[PDB]
Amino acid sequence: DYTAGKEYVELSSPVPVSQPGKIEVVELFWYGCPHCYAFEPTIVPWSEKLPADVHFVRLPALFGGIWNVHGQMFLTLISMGVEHDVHNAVFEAIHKEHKKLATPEEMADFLAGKGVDKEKFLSTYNSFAIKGQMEKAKKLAMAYQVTGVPTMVVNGKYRFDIGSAGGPEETLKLADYLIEKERAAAK
Numbered sequence: 159d160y161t162a163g164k165e166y167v168e169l170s171s172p173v174p175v176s177q178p179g180k181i182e183v184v185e186l187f188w189y190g191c192p193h194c195y196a197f198e199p200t201i202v203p204w205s206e207k208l209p210a211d212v213h214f215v216r217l218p219a220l221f222g223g224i225w226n227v228h229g230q231m232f233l234t235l236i237s238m239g240v241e242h243d244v245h246n247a248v249f250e251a252i253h254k255e256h257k258k259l260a261t262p263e264e265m266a267d268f269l270a271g272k273g274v275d276k277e278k279f280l281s282t283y284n285s286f287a288i289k290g291q292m293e294k295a296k297k298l299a300m301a302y303q304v305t306g307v308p309t310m311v312v313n314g315k316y317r318f319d320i321g322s323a324g325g326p327e328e329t330l331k332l333a334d335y336l337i338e339k340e341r342a343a344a345k
Contacts, residue, residue: 165332166318173301173314180213181340183333184311186304188219189228193320194308195253198246200326201308204333212337219307220296224260228252231265233291234283235274244272312336 162168175182185201187194205214218229231248235241251257251268259265262283266276282288302311309319310329316336323329 160332160335165323165328166312166316166336169302169311169315169317171301173298173311175213175314176215177213180211181337182311182313183208183212183214183337184298184302185214185216186219186299186302186309186311187216187307188221188225189232189248189259190224190252191307192253195249197308197320197326197329198249200330202246204330208337211341217295217298219299219304219309220292221299226292227260229295230283230288230292231259231262233288233295234279235269237282237285237288237291238274238278240274244269244274247272313340315340 160166176184183205185205208214216232218225218232220226220229232241235244235248248259252259257264257268259268262280265283266274266279269279270276302309302317304311304317306319309317310333311317312333313336318329318332320326320329323332
């Protein structure tokens, strides 16, 4: 029922996916983005129920300043294997508890309260590997031609957001539709 050019657009230059062989679903986000926070109760449970051939990932939008700092925190937590465990807490700290989480010392101190090893967080945050991950995330957002958040990209090919889909539920229904489109495709 959806129409290319209306609720979603097809990227004329499709982008490689992070896990070849799975249908990718990317949510570009920023931890400090209030619409992103408000979307969480919709996208979180949906993301946890996806089938075995779908790979859902969040990608931080590194659009400068505090977005880069918060994005670097995200990527650090992913590298440490703990983002999923502290994800809701980071959103709640920023939006309900008034925590800025604006420097790695502040981040580490907060995250220690949630069980995260502070010395490993700081070493990882400042690591050369994370410099590479930051660059890759930047380049992906450029390739998706994304200019704000939250924005969804399915299989490196289809871009849409809450406004274009027509609401938060509609965004997930559209994602589901596009996932089926890609599952049906020749390979």
